[PDB]
Design a protein around this ligand. Structure first.
Ligand SMILES: *[C@@H]1O[C@H](CO)[C@@H](O[C@@H]2O[C@H](CO)[C@@H](O)[C@H](O)[C@H]2NC(C)=O)[C@H](O)[C@H]1NC(C)=O
Ligand SMILES: [Ca+2]
Ligand SMILES: [Ca+2]
Ligand SMILES: [Ca+2]
Ligand SMILES: [Ca+2]
Ligand code: NA
Ligand code: NA
Length: 349
């Protein structure tokens, strides 16, 4: 007869954002998530799809109520003028506002993913490294791009530029700073130097021409936005998938928590490292564990067993694909064999 776990309470919290209330809504919340959607269609199916999306927002709204995150709906017809002023263009899409930044969310429309994302948005844009714990944590990041700069202190003109740049990419690309010469030494940073670490790469590339303006940093990050090996992540999956390489993606499935999946991931990292300067190569790593609801679809569509590592090439137009044969009674292919296979497949078609 104990206390129940928290449950969705069925109380409506998602705001109908309109001409009359939108200014007040913005004032009330530090972070605001707005779904820009189309007016109700006549067909039951469309209505049910919208009903689901709105309830997903309700769940997130309940979870994040105490943290001052607000959720709202902007109707492209009824609220056309609000959309105009706020720059809402993308049909049935989520926009996130924090102070003077808009984020055009391009990730999974699930309560889990949205809540984690908005919790990340709430955080300060630069992570400072002081302790050994924090430095170690920084060093252990590999599945995303990361930047680290060394500056005199928070009042350095060059640190402020770095923070402005950080805000432009927040919370997708973590920006770290240190003001401690001992930390800078371990990181091999000179004062005002910023090191850019491509995902899954051991060695950073230093942003040239320090000290760097906000624009120099932003330009550099944009030019280096696509890592040679990048992970499909729920928070960013649509942006990653839509960034195809001339109509195809090389896709690798590997369950990191599995011995074979782990070994395969290490091989993919070697392939990446050996081809890092090749701008025509990007491989998407998908860990099936991250996307339980898509595994049946992938297994059916690609005709593969996702309990084993896989690598293939996928046509983004129609999901046509080809997958490398690997005998699970022998060792996984070496990096050289993977590259050879990719060459064979990509030269022919
Ligand atoms: C990816 O798949 C699509 C088919 O869904 C291919 O597009 C077609 O290509 C053929 C020639 O092979 C054309 O005759 C059709 O008009 C195309 N249909 C379209 C564009 O919808 C496309 O070639 C494939 N990309 C590859 C193989 O790299
Ligand atoms: Ca509205
Ligand atoms: Ca250095
Ligand atoms: Ca400069
Ligand atoms: Ca690279
Ligand atoms: Na992040
Ligand atoms: Na295509």
């Amino acid at each position: 007869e104990g206390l129940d776990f928290p449950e969705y309470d069925g109380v409506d919290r998602v705001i109908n954002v309109n001409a009359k209330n939108y200014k007040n809504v913005f004032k009330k919340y530090e972070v605001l998530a707005l779904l820009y959607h189309e007016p109700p269609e006549d067909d039951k199916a469309s209505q049910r799809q919208f009903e689901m999306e709105e309830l997903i927002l309700e769940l997130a709204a309940q979870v994040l109520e105490d943290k001052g995150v607000g959720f709202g709906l902007v109707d492209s017809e009824k609220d056309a003028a609000v959309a105009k002023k706020l720059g809402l263009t993308e049909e049935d899409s989520i926009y996130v506002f924090k102070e003077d930044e808009v984020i055009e969310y391009d990730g999974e429309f699930s309560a889990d993913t949205l809540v984690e994302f908005l919790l990340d948005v709430l955080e300060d844009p630069v992570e400072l490294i002081e302790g050994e714990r924090e430095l170690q944590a920084f060093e252990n990041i590999e599945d995303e791009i990361k930047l680290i700069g060394y500056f005199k202190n928070k009042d350095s003109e060059h640190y402020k530029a770095f923070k402005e740049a950080a805000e432009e990419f927040h919370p997708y690309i973590p920006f770290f700073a240190t003001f401690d010469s001992k930390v800078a030494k371990k990181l091999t940073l000179k004062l005002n130097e910023i090191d850019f670490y491509e995902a899954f790469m051991e060695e950073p590339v230093t942003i040239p021409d320090k000290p760097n303006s906000e624009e120099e940093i932003v330009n550099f990050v944009e030019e280096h936005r696509r890592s040679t090996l990048r992970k499909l992540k729920p928070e960013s999956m649509y942006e990653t998938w839509e960034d195809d390489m001339d109509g195809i993606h090389i896709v690798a499935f590997a369950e990191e928590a599995d011995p074979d999946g782990y070994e395969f991931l290490e091989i993919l990292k070697s392939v990446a490292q050996d081809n890092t300067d090749n701008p025509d190569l990007s491989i998407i790593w998908i860990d099936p564990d991250d996307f339980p609801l898509l595994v049946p679809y992938w297994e059916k569509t690609f005709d593969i067993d996702l309990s084993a590592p896989q690598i293939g090439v996928v046509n983004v137009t129609d999901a046509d694909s080809v997958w490398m044969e690997m005998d699970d009674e022998e060792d996984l292919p070496s990096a050289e064999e993977l590259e050879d296979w990719l060459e064979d497949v990509l030269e022919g078609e």
